Amino acid sequence: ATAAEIAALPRQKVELVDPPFVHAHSQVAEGGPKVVEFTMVIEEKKIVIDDAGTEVHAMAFNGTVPGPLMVVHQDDYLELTLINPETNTLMHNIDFHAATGALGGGGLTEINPGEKTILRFKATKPGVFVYHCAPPGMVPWHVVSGMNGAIMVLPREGLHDGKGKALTYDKIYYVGEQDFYVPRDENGKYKKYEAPGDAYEDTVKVMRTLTPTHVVFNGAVGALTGDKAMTAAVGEKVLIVHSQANRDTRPHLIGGHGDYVWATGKFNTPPDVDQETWFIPGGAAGAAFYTFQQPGIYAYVNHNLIEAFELGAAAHFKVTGEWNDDLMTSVLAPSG
Amino acid sequence: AAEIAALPRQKVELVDPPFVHAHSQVAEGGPKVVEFTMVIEEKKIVIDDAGTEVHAMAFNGTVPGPLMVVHQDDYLELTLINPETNTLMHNIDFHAATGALGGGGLTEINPGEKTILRFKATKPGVFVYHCAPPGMVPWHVVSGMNGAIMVLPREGLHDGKGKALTYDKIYYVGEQDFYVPRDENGKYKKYEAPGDAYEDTVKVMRTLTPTHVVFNGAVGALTGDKAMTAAVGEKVLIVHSQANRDTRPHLIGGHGDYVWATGKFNTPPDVDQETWFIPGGAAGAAFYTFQQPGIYAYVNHNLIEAFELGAAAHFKVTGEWNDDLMTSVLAPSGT
Amino acid sequence: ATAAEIAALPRQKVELVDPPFVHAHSQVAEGGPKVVEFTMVIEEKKIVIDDAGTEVHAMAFNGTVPGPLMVVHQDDYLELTLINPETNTLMHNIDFHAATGALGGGGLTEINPGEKTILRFKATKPGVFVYHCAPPGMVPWHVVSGMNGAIMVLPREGLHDGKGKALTYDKIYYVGEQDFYVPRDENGKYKKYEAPGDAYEDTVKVMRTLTPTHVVFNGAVGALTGDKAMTAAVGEKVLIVHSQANRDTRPHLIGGHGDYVWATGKFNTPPDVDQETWFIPGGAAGAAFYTFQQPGIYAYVNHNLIEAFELGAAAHFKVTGEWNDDLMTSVLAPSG
Ligand SMILES: [Cl-]
Ligand SMILES: [Cl-]
Ligand SMILES: [Cl-]
Ligand SMILES: [Cu+2]
Ligand SMILES: [Cu+2]
Ligand SMILES: [Cu+2]
Ligand SMILES: [Cu+2]
Ligand SMILES: [Cu+2]
Ligand SMILES: [Cu+2]
Structure with missing residues (x-):
């Protein structure tokens, strides 16, 4: 792929749905490689997790635990707009296990409350893969506060x-x-x-x-x-x-x-x-x-x-x- | 399903683990109904040399329960007995079986009841079976109410x-x-x-x-x-x-x-x-x-x-x- | 198979290097089967395991945790000289998961301080395999005191x-x-x-x-x-x-x-x-x-x-x- 070829590729906006449901997709890919665009807003919020009203301060991609499933095909590019609203209090980022380099993208997507970032990666390997937030020095806390999800890279x-x-x-x-x-x-x-x-x-x-x-x-x-x-x-x-x-x-x-x-x-x-x-x-x-x-x-x-x-x-x-x-x-x- | 009663039937004698009842590795003929019976015993078992006890809930009287052997596409027909001297309802979930929670939804037996379940062993392998009374599932399993079956090709x-x-x-x-x-x-x-x-x-x-x-x-x-x-x-x-x-x-x-x-x-x-x-x-x-x-x-x-x-x-x-x-x-x- | 055939094989003495490095070796076997000779001294030694300076009495093959990686090829023989210095306090041995019989060798290698032993085994199965000490009655304590390592039997x-x-x-x-x-x-x-x-x-x-x-x-x-x-x-x-x-x-x-x-x-x-x-x-x-x-x-x-x-x-x-x-x-x- 040349610089000419990468910029020439189709862009396609995709709206996510809440788990356990999966946004519409085609199992067999339609046409050639494309840049699939997704947006997710981060929400820190109190959730109740059990019948006794136990509370967690959830840290939630798109407001859900888990984060929604994103679906692409092999050699597409996933381009995520990640937003951390001014209402949140913590820095967050994202590590896609499906991506190569910069700690899955974590090293590039570290956003304070009130900021946004746009990460693109090539989905070179077919399969289902975890993604999760991973701020240095505090990774297990964000992850066990529910800030994780998955994607599927279909062949x-x-x-x-x-x-x-x-x-x-x-x-x-x-x-x-x-x-x-x-x-x-x-x-x-x-x-x-x-x-x-x-x-x-x-x-x-x-x-x-x-x-x-x-x-x-x-x-x-x-x-x-x-x-x-x-x-x-x-x-x-x-x-x-x-x-x-x-x-x-x-x-x-x-x-x-x-x-x-x-x-x-x-x-x-x-x-x-x-x-x-x-x-x-x-x-x-x-x-x-x-x-x-x-x-x-x-x-x-x-x-x-x-x-x-x-x-x-x-x-x-x-x-x-x-x-x-x-x-x-x-x-x-x-x-x- | 009507023609299952035309198939050869076989009553197996189970044995205590670690031994496995007699069987042939290659199937001897076309599909059979293989028949098993197991009586559930709630009993105390001693688990170490310090005399520690468990309230065992034991298929056929043993932890684990015995190994049943059938061949792919045979029917396993289990008669499962919950004696009147037991205190708990019990049942059986075969991981080898398809439908009704592996059979658990069809085998709930109170002390003083039996039931007979039949299933087609459609997939070859070794599979867990275990008791699974709704509301107290892992209690029964970790009291030793679990075993396995082998479905040979x-x-x-x-x-x-x-x-x-x-x-x-x-x-x-x-x-x-x-x-x-x-x-x-x-x-x-x-x-x-x-x-x-x-x-x-x-x-x-x-x-x-x-x-x-x-x-x-x-x-x-x-x-x-x-x-x-x-x-x-x-x-x-x-x-x-x-x-x-x-x-x-x-x-x-x-x-x-x-x-x-x-x-x-x-x-x-x-x-x-x-x-x-x-x-x-x-x-x-x-x-x-x-x-x-x-x-x-x-x-x-x-x-x-x-x-x-x-x-x-x-x-x-x-x-x-x-x-x-x-x-x-x-x-x-x-040195 | 026979004692004569084994004796006729070439010998090779190999020097071990400290993990995470691995001693020089060739991926494709150079020549036919040989008897590969290794020497490991067991050292009961104080080691520090965190920045707080927490101290463990390690039981370390060659003085490192893990013990070093030994590299052989399939159907070579591995011939280990194991030594337990008079200064040590405990009996030790070695179980090679790569080996066949006498509990991976543990049965034949029980050495009190001031004793040594030479075990030879034939490397019949290609892969990486754990080895660890296993003295009857205190097996896990030796292993989680760091007395373990691995070998690679390349095809x-x-x-x-x-x-x-x-x-x-x-x-x-x-x-x-x-x-x-x-x-x-x-x-x-x-x-x-x-x-x-x-x-x-x-x-x-x-x-x-x-x-x-x-x-x-x-x-x-x-x-x-x-x-x-x-x-x-x-x-x-x-x-x-x-x-x-x-x-x-x-x-x-x-x-x-x-x-x-x-x-x-x-x-x-x-x-x-x-x-x-x-x-x-x-x-x-x-x-x-x-x-x-x-x-x-x-x-x-x-x-x-x-x-x-x-x-x-x-x-x-x-x-x-x-x-x-x-x-x-x-x-x-x-x-x-
Ligand atoms: Cl990670
Ligand atoms: Cl189950
Ligand atoms: Cl072992
Ligand atoms: Cu986060
Ligand atoms: Cu990760
Ligand atoms: Cu039960
Ligand atoms: Cu189960
Ligand atoms: Cu030892
Ligand atoms: Cu071992």
């Missing part, structure tokens, strides 16, 4: 199985998983603070135990359950992108599988197949492809079941369609 | 390149994280009912730090009378599961020649593994040919977990020492 | 990708990662002890929490930073061997990737590609191959970021060469 040809056959999903969800480290007082009750900075020393004491107090999808216990369950129909092909910026996880679809799982997140490494539970190390995204076969409620968990059912790491899928008694049947229903 | 095991892999022995290591409450003196507490230990146990669990990490339900379980045996030249498959917590198996003195670390037989295996990794909520399988005789240890390779918390087993291998592979050129002696 | 034809094309590195680093469990007093300050034995009971308590006090590269917090930073240039192909004898890790090059990663560390298992963060279980070594594309400072971390930036698991690369604006550019600098 220009869309996705393929290990023998090169097309894998085309009908829909795509993004589950961002968050470990929170909320300080308690002597009596075991979670503390509240006036400004984010007040909580700093207390939170580090918690971080250093390496034991989160909460492990949550979409920013809170139960954000993806009940009426906010994810949805599919028997016969639909669903891609579930899962990210964890700081800590290991082990996703599992209770009553399903991952028919094809890029556990490492990278689309040039052939997927694993038929998975019960896959493993995503902290600081990575992964993706699982699954065709639903049975209707009903499913759970989708971090299969450390303490983390899933005590600490908040559980979602639902609501699936419509016809039951298949060949796959499974109750021969004799509970009886005595 | 119809044509048996192969490597990545299509070469048949055929074992002489198979063992099943179920690894258990336990969360035993302690008193003010750091003494493990004892209780008289599963229910009475609940909240104390929940508090230990939320620390995410097991007080014990054991094979076959106890420190030293898989040693001495339950040491696993082989001879130089024999090909052994070591099925390993952990229903709730990561492990990193390692055979001390050997390797995993072929490891399906994810547990799934259509994923080509890793080769020449020193230490492999099985995530909480999965099973994996490691294939090795013994080359050297002696006692081997087999460990979770967080060695604090192996050697302080209980996660070590032994293999006992007969045969001829091979000096090409390894020899002591100078025995330990003065 | 005779050198490294290849999954599809049989040669991968030749320009340089190699060995990053040994250590978890330490350092006892604290009633007011949370780290303790000192007069002999290794004095630290025993207190350390065991910290160990059983499974929460390390420090997580470090090359023996100490910041050991691979400043003027000890690893270095490279744009265009340069770097292999990074990373080991962890006791505890998982999830290595990440900040601003970079793992182009080819043998996450399991074994060269007959095809590498993952395009990795953002890879995973190395406790008890293993792994290797990542990367071509630097951009100049500047990188950090190379365990991507549990609390472990990286609170507990010490972060190293730097200094990289010289020309900035590539096509790969990344700051379209708009922080402003407003």
